[PDB]
């Protein structure tokens, strides 16, 4: 057995399975428990965070550490598609735990409130969804839970969302977030997460804005003055030091050599609008609606969504072999057809993502048009069948392509059976695309994976790619290093409506550090 | 720019003189000065 500082023992057979970084994470989690503080397991997608949590909880119950003897009644809030995944991992890794699902699928077949009461009074693990936490906040918080692990806790990123306010009602100090991307659009998200795990460190949201968000963000713009860049550097370093003890973020670069993952590629194809697609795009950017948008009269959403649809496929004006969604009318669909042909002749398995459900239906129709054997999972599929479906695609290699929406197909599922991954449509949030592309390159991937991220050249999609590159740079400025190069590719203004198709310290080290920070 | 002396029957002043002084070229609006007489050492 592995013996930690005070009284925490994790069983030897369980400990041996874990990798070096995973047991380092268990150590860190128990140091947080000693401090009675929350944390973010920021390890990227696929590095293993369900296993670290399961091992830490198993050692906590096993160790009988001193209301609660060992482990109390814990609640795990996760996306609906991964609830049964958590159940399976708990059963395989620590079968002694009672692990009930609070969901319509569930296993209880009686009043839910009875299930919450039973798990609370039995010191079991209640896995629930974020929607249920919002809905059952009256009952979920009356029972003095011990641990409130939030899997994919970046769903709490909006400080004013009802789910966030619900999840911030738990009285316990032991609040954990599992999310390999705990910053997706700006630093408000980081503040929301750190308000959840440890309400005090980053102060009130106004104060956090004034001290960190405006300095750090405003120093990343292309026109930033050098003094402002240095101020942003100072603020980013301060924030990194502030959030260091409670963020544990391991990359797949410092762990890849110690984990034997196969090679990865992250190509970004710039697809070409077809003549008809280009015509529709040019007609729309020349229309009066976009003119009204640029004048501030109407909301930008109509034009933005229309351009995204046009780049996806001209489903605005639905033009035999001229049915709705015909592949040859969209350039990205032509590229996807070529890629699918090549990969099928190479005997490989492909993971085809989409932001839009309608574009997913169009891709599904195009796949039946070919002889490809597909398998689809979007928000409409019943949750109870989602983990089965994933297992199916992970089990038999007869299934060639796995269609997905990035909101359901991403976000914590394991699809290591897939070999190639193609992100058909960019999103405004970089993190959606990141999780979608890490669905394949995970622990258990025995083959070389590559990611093909399709963008239409000179369209709104390239501008979205630029916006999310800027967001990723802003995130890296505070997650990996503060020396981040300024985003210079664009100014990120409201001219994304244009078509531009190509062709003890002894008071001296401390004083020295104060001088260093102030001279910046 | 003319001094006008009036007397309000119901007031704390027996007599109050005013001038709405205004520089001839319209640089500014007229500024009024009052020189009053406190009502009835």
């Amino acid at each position: 057995d592995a013996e930690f500082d005070e009284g925490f023992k994790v069983p030897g057979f369980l400990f041996k399975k874990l990798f070096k970084y995973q047991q380092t994470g268990v150590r860190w989690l128990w140091e947080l428990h000693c401090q009675q503080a929350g944390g973010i397991l920021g390890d990227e997608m696929g590095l293993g965070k369900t296993i670290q949590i399961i091992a830490f909880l198993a050692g906590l119950s096993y160790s009988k550490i001193r209301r609660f003897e060992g482990l109390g009644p814990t609640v795990i809030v996760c996306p609906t598609t991964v609830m049964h995944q958590w159940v399976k991992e708990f059963h395989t890794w620590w079968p002694p735990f009672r692990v009930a699902i609070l969901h319509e699928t569930g296993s209880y077949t009686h009043k839910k409130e009875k299930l919450i009461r039973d798990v609370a009074h039995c010191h079991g693990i209640l896995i629930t969804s974020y929607s249920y936490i919002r809905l059952m906040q009256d009952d979920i918080s009356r029972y003095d839970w011990h641990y409130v692990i939030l899997d994919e806790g970046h769903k709490i990123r909006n400080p004013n969302a009802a789910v966030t306010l619900a999840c911030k009602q738990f009285r316990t100090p032991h609040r954990i977030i599992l999310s390999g991307s705990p910053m997706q659009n700006n630093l408000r998200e980081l503040w929301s997460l750190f308000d959840f795990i440890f309400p005090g460190k980053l102060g009130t949201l106004p104060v956090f804005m004034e001290q960190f968000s405006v300095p750090i963000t405003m120093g990343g713009y292309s026109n930033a003055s050098p003094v402002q860049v240095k101020t942003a550097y100072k603020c980013a370093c301060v924030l990194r030091d502030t959030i260091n003890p409670y963020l544990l973020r391991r990359m797949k670069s410092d762990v890849k050599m110690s984990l034997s993952l196969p090679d990865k590629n992250e190509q970004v194809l710039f697809c070409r609008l077809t003549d008809e697609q280009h015509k529709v795009y040019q007609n729309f950017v020349d229309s009066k609606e976009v003119y009204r948008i640029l004048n501030g009269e109407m909301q930008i959403f109509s034009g933005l969504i229309a351009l995204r649809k046009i780049c996806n496929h001209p489903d605005l004006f639905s033009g035999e072999e001229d049915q709705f969604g015909y592949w040859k009318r969209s350039g990205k669909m032509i590229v996807v057809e070529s890629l699918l042909k090549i990969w099928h002749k190479q005997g490989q398995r492909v993971l085809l993502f989409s932001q839009s459900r309608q574009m997913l239906d169009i891709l599904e129709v195009f796949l039946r048009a070919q002889k490809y054997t597909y398998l689809k999972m979007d928000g409409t599929t019943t949750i109870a069948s989602r983990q089965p479906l994933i297992t199916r695609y992970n089990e038999d290699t007869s299934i060639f392509v796995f269609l997905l929406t990035t909101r359901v197909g991403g976000l914590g599922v394991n699809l290591t059976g897939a070999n190639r991954v193609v992100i058909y449509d960019p999103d405004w949030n970089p993190s959606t695309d990141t999780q979608a592309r890490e669905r394949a390159w995970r622990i258990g991937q025995k083959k070389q994976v590559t990611v093909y991220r399709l963008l239409t050249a000179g369209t709104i999609e390239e501008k979205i790619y630029h916006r999310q590159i800027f967001k990723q740079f802003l995130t890296n400025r505070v997650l990996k290093d503060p020396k981040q190069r300024r985003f210079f590719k664009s100014n990120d203004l409201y001219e994304l409506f244009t078509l531009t198709s190509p062709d003890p310290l002894a008071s001296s080290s401390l004083l020295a550090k104060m001088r260093a920070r102030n001279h910046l | 720019n003319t001094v006008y002396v009036f007397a309000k029957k119901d007031s704390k002043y027996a007599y109050t003189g005013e001038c709405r002084s205004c520089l001839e070229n319209s640089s500014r609006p007229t500024s009024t000065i009052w020189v009053s007489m406190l009502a009835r050492a």
């Binding site: 004013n160 306010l165 009130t204 949201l205 | -």
Partner: protein
């Protein structure tokens, strides 16, 4: 007490633009500041900011 719609009718205009009544606009103001104040008193807010 929010009054009903008949106390504050939304009169339609020569086109389709539905003009709301002064009471409706004022209830909009009360609602926005009430919601905003609610989120401040629920969260940590400066006593003078709450005031």
């Amino acid at each position: 007490p929010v009054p009903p719609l008949s106390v504050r009718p939304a009169v339609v205009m020569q086109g389709s633009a539905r003009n709301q009544d002064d009471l409706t606009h004022k209830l909009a103001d009360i609602v926005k500041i009430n919601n905003q104040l609610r989120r401040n008193e629920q969260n940590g807010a400066a006593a003078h900011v709450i005031a």
